[PDB]
Write a protein that binds this DNA or RNA. Structure first.
Ligand SMILES: [Zn+2]
Length: 63
DNA sequence: AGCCTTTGACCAGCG
DNA sequence: TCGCTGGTCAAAGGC
């Protein structure tokens, strides 16, 4: 489960990418007409979670 | 009812 | 040309 960020997301895939221990998850912003997506993947070194966003939101943070 | 995660299949770029 | 592979599709099931 990914960290909260004030936006609403839907998970739409998960893949174990080469050179990673932990699988990577793919989410999309459920705002219709908004196509921001983000990737989420943990890593053991330093207990790290990288969240990578592609695209700027169409709209204010949901109510 | 509607929206979520899970999942293997599908996909397109490229070495 | 054709596999590998990171990214996406969508059916199935659960709440
Ligand atoms: Zn958005």
């Amino acid at each position: 489960a990914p960290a909260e960020d004030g936006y609403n997301w839907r998970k739409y895939g998960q893949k174990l990418v080469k050179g990673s221990e932990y699988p990577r998850s793919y989410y999309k912003c459920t705002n219709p007409n908004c196509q921001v997506k983000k990737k989420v993947e943990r890593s053991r070194e330093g207990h790290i979670t990288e969240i990578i966003y592609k695209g700027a939101h169409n709209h204010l943070k949901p109510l």
